[PDB]
Amino acid sequence: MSEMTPREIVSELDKHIIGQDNAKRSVAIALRNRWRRMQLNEELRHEVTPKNILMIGPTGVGKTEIARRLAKLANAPFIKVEATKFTEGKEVDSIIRDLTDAAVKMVRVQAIEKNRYRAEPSAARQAFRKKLREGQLIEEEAAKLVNPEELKQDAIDAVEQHGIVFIDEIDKICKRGSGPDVSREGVQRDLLPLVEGCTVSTKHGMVKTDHILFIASGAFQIAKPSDLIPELQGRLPIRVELQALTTSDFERILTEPNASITVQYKALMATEGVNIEFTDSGIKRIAEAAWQVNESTENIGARRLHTVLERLMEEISYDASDLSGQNITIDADYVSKHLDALVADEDLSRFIL
Amino acid sequence: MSEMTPREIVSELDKHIIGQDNAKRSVAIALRNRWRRMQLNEELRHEVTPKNILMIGPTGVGKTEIARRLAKLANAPFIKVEATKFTEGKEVDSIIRDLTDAAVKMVRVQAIEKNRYRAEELAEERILDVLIPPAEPSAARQAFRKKLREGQKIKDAMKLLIEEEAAKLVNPEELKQDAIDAVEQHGIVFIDEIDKICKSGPDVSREGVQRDLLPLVEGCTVSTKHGMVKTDHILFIASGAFQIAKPSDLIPELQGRLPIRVELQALTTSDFERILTEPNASITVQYKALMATEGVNIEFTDSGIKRIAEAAWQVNESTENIGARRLHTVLERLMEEISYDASDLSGQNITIDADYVSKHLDALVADEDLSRFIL
Amino acid sequence: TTIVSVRRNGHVVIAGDGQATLGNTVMKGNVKKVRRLYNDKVIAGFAGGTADAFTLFELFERKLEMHQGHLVKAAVELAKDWRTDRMLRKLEALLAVADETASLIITGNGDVVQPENDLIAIGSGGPYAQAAARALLENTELSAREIAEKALDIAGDICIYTNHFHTIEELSYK
Numbered sequence: 090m091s092e093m094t095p096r097e098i099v100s101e102l103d104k105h106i107i108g109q110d111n112a113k114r115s116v117a118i119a120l121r122n123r124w125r126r127m128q129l130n131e132e133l134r135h136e137v138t139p140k141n142i143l144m145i146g147p148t149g150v151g152k153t154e155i156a157r158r159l160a161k162l163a164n165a166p167f168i169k170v171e172a173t174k175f176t177e178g179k180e181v182d183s184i185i186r187d188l189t190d191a192a193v194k195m196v197r198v199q200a201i202e203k204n205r206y207r208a209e210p211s212a213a214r215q216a217f218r219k220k221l222r223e224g225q226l227i228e229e230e231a232a233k234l235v236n237p238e239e240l241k242q243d244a245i246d247a248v249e250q251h252g253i254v255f256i257d258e259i260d261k262i263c264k265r266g267s268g269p270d271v272s273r274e275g276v277q278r279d280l281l282p283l284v285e286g287c288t289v290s291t292k293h294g295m296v297k298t299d300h301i302l303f304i305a306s307g308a309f310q311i312a313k314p315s316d317l318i319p320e321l322q323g324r325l326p327i328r329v330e331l332q333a334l335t336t337s338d339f340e341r342i343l344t345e346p347n348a349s350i351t352v353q354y355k356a357l358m359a360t361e362g363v364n365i366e367f368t369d370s371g372i373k374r375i376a377e378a379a380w381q382v383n384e385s386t387e388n389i390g391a392r393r394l395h396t397v398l399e400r401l402m403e404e405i406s407y408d409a410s411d412l413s414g415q416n417i418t419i420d421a422d423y424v425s426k427h428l429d430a431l432v433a434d435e436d437l438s439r440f441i442l
Numbered sequence: 443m444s445e446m447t448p449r450e451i452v453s454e455l456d457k458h459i460i461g462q463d464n465a466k467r468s469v470a471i472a473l474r475n476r477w478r479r480m481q482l483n484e485e486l487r488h489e490v491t492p493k494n495i496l497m498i499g500p501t502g503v504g505k506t507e508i509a510r511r512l513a514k515l516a517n518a519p520f521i522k523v524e525a526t527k528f529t530e531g532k533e534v535d536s537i538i539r540d541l542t543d544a545a546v547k548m549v550r551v552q553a554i555e556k557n558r559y560r561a562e563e564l565a566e567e568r569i570l571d572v573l574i575p576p577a578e579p580s581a582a583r584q585a586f587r588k589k590l591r592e593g594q595k596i597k598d599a600m601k602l603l604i605e606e607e608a609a610k611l612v613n614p615e616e617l618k619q620d621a622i623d624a625v626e627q628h629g630i631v632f633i634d635e636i637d638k639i640c641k642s643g644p645d646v647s648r649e650g651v652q653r654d655l656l657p658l659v660e661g662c663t664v665s666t667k668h669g670m671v672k673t674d675h676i677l678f679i680a681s682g683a684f685q686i687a688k689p690s691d692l693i694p695e696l697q698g699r700l701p702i703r704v705e706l707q708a709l710t711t712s713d714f715e716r717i718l719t720e721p722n723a724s725i726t727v728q729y730k731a732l733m734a735t736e737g738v739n740i741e742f743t744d745s746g747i748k749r750i751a752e753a754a755w756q757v758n759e760s761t762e763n764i765g766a767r768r769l770h771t772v773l774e775r776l777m778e779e780i781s782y783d784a785s786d787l788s789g790q791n792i793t794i795d796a797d798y799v800s801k802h803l804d805a806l807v808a809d810e811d812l813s814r815f816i817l
Numbered sequence: 818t819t820i821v822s823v824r825r826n827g828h829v830v831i832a833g834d835g836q837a838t839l840g841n842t843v844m845k846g847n848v849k850k851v852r853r854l855y856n857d858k859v860i861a862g863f864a865g866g867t868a869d870a871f872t873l874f875e876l877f878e879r880k881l882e883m884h885q886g887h888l889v890k891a892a893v894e895l896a897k898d899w900r901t902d903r904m905l906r907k908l909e910a911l912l913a914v915a916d917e918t919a920s921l922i923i924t925g926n927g928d929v930v931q932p933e934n935d936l937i938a939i940g941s942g943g944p945y946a947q948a949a950a951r952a953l954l955e956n957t958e959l960s961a962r963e964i965a966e967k968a969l970d971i972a973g974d975i976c977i978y979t980n981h982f983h984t985i986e987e988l989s990y991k
């Protein structure tokens with residue numbers, strides 16, 4: 090739908106994700122082929138199929154955030170699914186069903202937005218209108234303005250054309266080499282029709298999967314993509330590896346991204362009348378703290394930044410009511426005071442952090 | 443339905459599939475028996491049953507594409523089902539259910555193509571009644587008809603009339619009943635990897651799927667929300683590598699319901715070069731038109747095509763042989779730099795030469811440890 | 818069989834013989850009992866069946882990727898799965914591995930061991946090599962490569978299961 094060029098897509102993704110440009114470039118090519126397909130003639134539009142992507146890397150390096158912001162960037166329907174959920178069980182067709190139910194709520198809430206603002210004047214008329222806005226039918230008018238037959242037919246077209254599905258941890262359904270390998274590879278066969286252009290029935294309507302884009306992800310440390318079934322390897326034309334995040338990336342993720350968690354904590358304490366400010370040295374030691382826990386115990390990627398920051402701010406967030414009108418500074422000494430005692434004890438870090 | 447002769451079918455398949463002529467000749471005989479049966483009398487049309495085919499060969503050599511282009515050639519309903527899906531569980535009758543659901547959407551969208559034309563005429567006559575209410579077309583009737591086609595709730599109204607008119611023009615009892623006739627008369631089903639259900643523990647569950655499949659080929663009736671379908675005249679295409687097992691390992695009732703057998707040959711490097719170019723809407727042609735959308739002109743040298751097929755061949759030998767599917771992964775890896783820059787390269791003529799292919803690929807093909815992840 | 822590892826002056830090496838015995842006869846004299854792993858950042862050796870080591874080495878690289886190349890923690894996870902898995906428990910071999918961090922032994926009992934001074938000597942001739950490598954390391958300035966080389970030759974003269982075909986993989990970190 091959107092006519093953004095691949096660089097315009099990556100530039101928008103840099104506003105949220107930090108680095109991992111190769112993954113940003115790969116998703117941009119897939120979203121740009123969508124607009125390229127519409128410019129083609131009747132024959133080629135059926136033959137061309139979406140260039141599905143397989144992200145590869147350790148957990149918490151942003152494989153999902155790229156997929157989320159991408160679907161949010163295109164206003165496309167989106168869903169994430171854990172491939173292991175089908176090891177036990179649920180049918181694989183539910184993926185398309187839930188994706189449409191999300192596309193329905195997406196177009197519907199977006200349809201309400203068009204119906205919201207709609208939902209010589211006399212001098213006495215304007216007078217009461219002014220008293221009314223000062224303070225002292227949204228249902229019936231938005232229902233009158235909405236077209237329920239349109240919202241349902243639209244969400245299908247939003248799924249069939251723009252829909253995006255992210256299959257997390259696909260590497261875990263690869264053969265480990267006999268028992269699980271049948272159940273694991275059996276899930277791969279059950280997913281095959283969805284990428285091979287099958288049709289799935291839904292209460293909202295009959296959806297076709299031919300042109301849906303898909304984004305698998307997996308660490309592939311145990312298994313490798315070549316362990317995937319041959320029919321599945323050919324349906325994932327684009328491959329990319331996401332690099333492990335460094336301490337410098339943690340320093341950037343804390344601040345540079347739009348609505349970064351540090352900015353979120355600042356606005357939250359602003360609600361209490363408190364002013365937060367992080368020193369560059371304080372952001373440095375926070376990133377240094379999260380890296381130590383990942384190296385000391387288990388590496389969960391950037392997700393460690395969340396648990397550390399909340400552990401650091403827990404005293405302020407509790408007192409923020411009584412500290413109204415005060416300006417609190419998070420300096421390097423403040424970071425070492427609330428954390429170095431915790432990071433030093435690995436046995437406690439596995440619980441508190 | 444179609445009256446094409448078996449050679450006419452193979453010649454059309456040659457436009458998409460490369461080689462594998464025996465598989466093309468075998469499927470052509472099955473589609474021709476369809477037309478041959480309708481010419482027969484009331485008795486023989488019942489006794490004659492479709493000549494089901496069993497494809498055999500390594501993965502990715504086009505077994506499925508023949509079945510896909512064959513059904514697309516006949517405009518028949520089609521579905522691909524993995525036989526291993528039933529080892530765990532779902533009922534086997536779902537095959538006919540999902541086939542009819544594809545047949546429903548197929549006849550419906552095709553019915554919209556007919557309604558797409560008449561509905562615009564009747565929709566125009568409806569919207570002209572508000573502009574020039576009636577008391578040879580009137581002069582104002584055409585003066586408004588011209589401004590309408592030139593383009594212009596009003597704009598929303600033209601869409602609502604396509605539904606009421608296409609609904610008024612369509613015959614749902616002739617449509618939902620047409621997909622059933624399309625399934626029963628023309629239906630096609632491709633059962634991939636049937637060799638994996640051949641034969642103690644798994645052998646019961648494996649052969650149990652065969653007995654569950656048996657009624658569908660021997661003939662039966664399945665209930666669906668769209669209607670009641672009979673499977674007697676549906677055509678089926680089973681496929682399997684049969685390296686672990688052999689067709690003789692299939693249950694005897696199933697071996698006799700697959701009269702036609704054919705083995706598909708492994709593709710060579712020369713066939714890869716043909717698949718890249720010769721087939722209609724070949725992936726090389728697809729990349730060319732795609733870059734054309736950005737204003738760029740792609741061109742592949744014969745040696746550049748030759749070194750891509752050699753690249754895909756080396757990976758299949760160096761690691762795992764996935765057949766012609768390897769061509770897709772190699773080509774996108776080669777074109778990823780152009781596909782990203784195509785916006786800024788508008789108005790330029792790019793040439794994919796042998797030096798360009800070796801520049802972007804040979805470093806990757808050289809490292810087998812990396813080829814498994816990237817290619 | 819004999820395999821030796823020495824670490825000195827920013828250098829560490831692993832050396833092993835090529836003899837493969839079947840009963841009282843020599844099956845193969847040029848066996849490669851040493852190789853590199855994990856992007857050539859790790860050197861390793863094995864005493865036992867060739868395939869049993871190739872299976873353990875591949876899984877060991879997997880454990881390194883999960884732990885970002887940490888040698889000790891990956892060795893524990895390998896020793897953990899080795900004793901645990903019914904398939905891996907059947908494997909019979911003596912692994913030796915080292916990186917710039919430290920050298921250690923791994924066994925099918927699940928035991929992970931780092932020798933004194935990171936001096937590894939395994940195989941039927943291992944104790945003989947440890948006796949010679951211990952003598953040179955304390956009484957000479959020889960580099961770790963020269964010690965593992967001369968020590969393995971002495972073990973081949975003594976052990977009947979060890980020969981003088983040699984394979985070495987040095988790692989310099991300084």
Ligand SMILES: Nc1ncnc2c1ncn2[C@H]1C[C@H](O)[C@@H](COP(=O)(O)OP(=O)(O)O)O1
Pocket residue numbers: 105106107108109147148149150151152153154155306342346390391392
């Ligand atoms: N490269 C990156 N830039 C910015 N934030 C990141 C990031 N990688 C991870 N994060 C943050 C944002 C997410 O809320 C959280 C989890 O990331 P994720 O996308 O779920 O990783 P994964 O795809 O490995 O599961 O970590």
Ligand SMILES: Nc1ncnc2c1ncn2[C@H]1C[C@H](O)[C@@H](COP(=O)(O)OP(=O)(O)O)O1
Pocket residue numbers: 320323458459460461462500501502503504505506507508681717721765766767
């Ligand atoms: N003979 C052939 N000609 C052209 N393309 C082919 C081909 N064989 C395979 N391909 C390509 C096109 C398909 O999109 C892809 C999948 O092939 P397939 O028909 O599924 O093989 P199989 O049925 O053996 O699994 O490979």
